[PDB]
Homo-oligomer: A and B are copies of this chain.
């Protein structure tokens, strides 16, 4: 079974695009694949932020993944900081990553108040994240192909010097989920990092907010009004259909037939009642999980236990190749 590493950034309200395009289909693939979901809190402190907020953000992100359907029996779900092997391999990989590679990373080269070594050094740690678990499928994140390429460069550069300690990871492009485009720029896809949030709709949004946001979405000035799928000409109405089709499963031609003679104010309202209906169940659930302090502390405890087992195997193999003397655990440790 192929092993898949995804990272859950503690900040960044999951959008309906994230859900329907990616995580929804990945919920249905936990038995075929060995999916690992790591809450990368050590990657978040690269940017300064409120200590209580990050702690709550970590716990928020956990419950929502659970709320999105990640089964902690089938899949491994943990907090990056709770598995030391991450920092630990991170340092060793610093010695097999070159200054220029890190500095030519398009993001950093761009950044202006916290040019910390975290910001610069994150891509090595992100390669330590992938490589510990012998990952072979990586779902290439947003604006982060560079990063996986650097992981592949690191792992080959290490394995070339010492042997196949690591699996070279390949990018994961699963079943393309729904096509969710930004609500005021249907040319652009929906991004969790969108500074203007009217292009987005988070998974935990008031039915009112869902309505207010789909109401402001861009349409066209076609007279007569038409609900037809033309991605070139009718983008915003195309997008409204792709979203709706995704929530309901109905086809684009079915939707067109259903909206014959209806205007856009109706399609909007209809798309908003369908979105918010989906998010009521997933929001019901979320709070159950978010309130169940015990259950949360258990999914963490069990989850990190499963990770830190698989990671120390790899970390031992690395430190062996490296030239280090092994930690002396107990007389009868092997």
Binding site for B on A (CB under 8 A): 41-42, 45-46, 49-55, 58-59, 79, 81-82, 84-88, 90-100, 102, 114-121, 124-125, 162, 297-298, 300-301, 304, 319-325, 327-329
Contact = CB atoms under 8 A, between A and B. Distances in A.
B91 A116 contact: no
A89 to B, nearest CB: 8
Contacts of A97: 116-118
A109 to B, nearest CB: 12
A125 B87 CA distance: 11
B46 A325 contact: no
Contact of A88 (B50, B84, B119): B84
Contacts of A322: 45, 51, 54
B117 A121 contact: yes
Contacts of A120: 94, 99, 117
Contact of A117 (B41, B55, B94): B94
A51 B321 contact: yes
Given A88-B88, A99-B117, 13 more contacts: A41-B325, A42-B92, A50-B323, A52-B323, A58-B325, A81-B319, A87-B87, A87-B91, A95-B116, A95-B117, A98-B114, A117-B121, A300-B327
Given A45-B322, A55-B324, A297-B328, A119 B91 contact: no
Nearest to A44: B323
A94 B116 contact: yes
Nearest to A102: B117
A116 B87 contact: no
Contacts of A81: 88, 319, 324-325, 327
A137 to B, nearest CB: 25
Contacts of A327: 79, 81-82, 300-301, 304
A91 B125 contact: yes
30 contacts: A41-B324, A41-B325, A42-B324, A45-B95, A45-B324, A46-B94, A46-B95, A50-B323, A51-B162, A51-B320, A51-B323, A54-B322, A54-B324, A79-B327, A82-B328, A84-B84, A84-B85, A87-B90, A88-B88, A91-B91, A93-B117, A94-B116, A94-B118, A94-B120, A95-B118, A99-B117, A100-B115, A117-B121, A297-B328, A300-B328
Contacts of A323: 41, 45, 49-55
B121 A94 contact: yes
Contacts of A329: 301
A319 B83 CA distance: 13
Contacts of A121: 94, 117, 121
A163 to B, nearest CB: 11
Nearest to A93: B117
Nearest to A321: B51
A324 B19 CA distance: 25
B94 A325 contact: no
A55 B325 CA distance: 5
By Cβ-Cβ distance, the 7 closest A-B pairs, closest first, are: A51-B323, A95-B118, A54-B323, A94-B117, A301-B328, A87-B87, A99-B115
